[PDB]
Amino acid sequence: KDAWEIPRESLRLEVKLGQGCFGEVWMGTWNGTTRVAIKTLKPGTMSPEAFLQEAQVMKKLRHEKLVQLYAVVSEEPIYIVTEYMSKGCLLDFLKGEMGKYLRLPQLVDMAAQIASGMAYVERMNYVHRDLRAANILVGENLVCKVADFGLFPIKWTAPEAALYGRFTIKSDVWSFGILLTELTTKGRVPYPGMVNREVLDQVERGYRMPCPPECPESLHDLMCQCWRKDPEERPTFEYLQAFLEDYFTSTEPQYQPGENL
Numbered sequence: 507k508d509a510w511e512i513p514r515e516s517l518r519l520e521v522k523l524g525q526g527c528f529g530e531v532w533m534g535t536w537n538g539t540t541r542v543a544i545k546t547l548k549p550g551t552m553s554p555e556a557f558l559q560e561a562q563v564m565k566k567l568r569h570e571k572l573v574q575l576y577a578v579v580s581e582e583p584i585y586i587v588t589e590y591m592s593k594g595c596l597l598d599f600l601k602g603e604m605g606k607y608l609r610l611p612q613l614v615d616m617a618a619q620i621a622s623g624m625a626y627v628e629r630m631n632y633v634h635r636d637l638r639a640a641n642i643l644v645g646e647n648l649v650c651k652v653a654d655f656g657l658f659p660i661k662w663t664a665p666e667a668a669l670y671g672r673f674t675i676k677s678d679v680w681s682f683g684i685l686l687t688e689l690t691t692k693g694r695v696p697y698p699g700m701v702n703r704e705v706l707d708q709v710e711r712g713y714r715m716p717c718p719p720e721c722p723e724s725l726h727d728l729m730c731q732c733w734r735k736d737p738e739e740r741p742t743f744e745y746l747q748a749f750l751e752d753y754f755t756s757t758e759p760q761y762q763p764g765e766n767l
């Protein structure tokens with residue numbers, strides 16, 4: 507019964523963006539004037555409280571690289587209202603029409619922003635648990651924001667988290683290393699050709715994805731640093747953030763555009 511509550515008629519659900527078993531997300535209009543994302547609860551498929559656990563967690567987390575909760579409707583039909591991201595999934599953005607044109611300079615910049623959102627998460631002592639391109643939202647002028655659609659994603663999960671449930675900001679960092687992979691193969695599923703079991707067995711015995719085609723060793727190496735066996739050997743988001751922002755001067759300042767990267 508908060509100050510996030512809004513009269514219902516002040517929402518116009520226009521285009522359907524996704525459907526799950528728990529509800530739907532629509533694009534729409536709030537207060538006649540402003541573009542929004544509207545999460546839905548399909549009644550009966552979970553409690554009112556356990557659906558509004560999302561809004562409570564987003565209420566304590568504000569930053570320009572995290573998707574912002576705007577408003578809620580706290581009685582059936584229930585709604586969670588966020589800012590609108592005109593480009594959708596980073597994943598879909600990488601794979602579709604805008605893929606051909608992305609270059610390492612754009613992809614590293616997208617990466618820096620995720621890093622920046624995740625550095626906020628680091629500082630608030632929170633853990634994402636599902637960092638991967640599917641959970642990053644893209645906006646105009648390539649803005650990227652950390653989000654969560656709510657969905658096991660083993661190809662992206664640090665092994666101590668997949669096996670023992672030791673989920674931390676450092677198992678998040680490993681996922682980041684995986685995300686760096688989707689940014690640089692424009693969206694391709696990591697560990698191509700391998701099923702989950704093949705992955706677990708192999709990363710466990712030290713296998714790590716090679717340098718993607720046309721991507722500098724110095725970024726592949728940043729990947730490898732994220733994928734160190736021991737969780738505490740992995741770098742922070744603050745470090746990852748500063749390494750990515752600075753990349754084209756400090757690390758690869760002799761970078762020349764190629765055919766894909």
Ligand SMILES: CC(C)(C)c1cc(NC(=O)Nc2ccccc2)n(-c2cccc(N)c2)n1
Binds near residue numbers: 523590
């Ligand atoms: C949680 C459910 C309702 C199942 C869902 C919602 C969406 N998609 C979105 O919410 N997209 C979106 C949300 C806000 C701004 C722009 C796009 N998807 C969806 C559809 C297609 C691809 C992806 N990655 C995600 N799935």
Ligand SMILES: CC(C)(C)c1cc(NC(=O)Nc2ccccc2)n(-c2cccc(N)c2)n1
Binds near residue numbers: 543559564586652
């Ligand atoms: C990255 C942080 C800011 C920590 C976050 C953001 C969200 N929620 C969303 O991304 N919600 C959302 C995403 C796309 C479209 C509509 C709503 N969550 C979140 C919190 C609790 C439950 C769920 N499912 C999702 N967490």
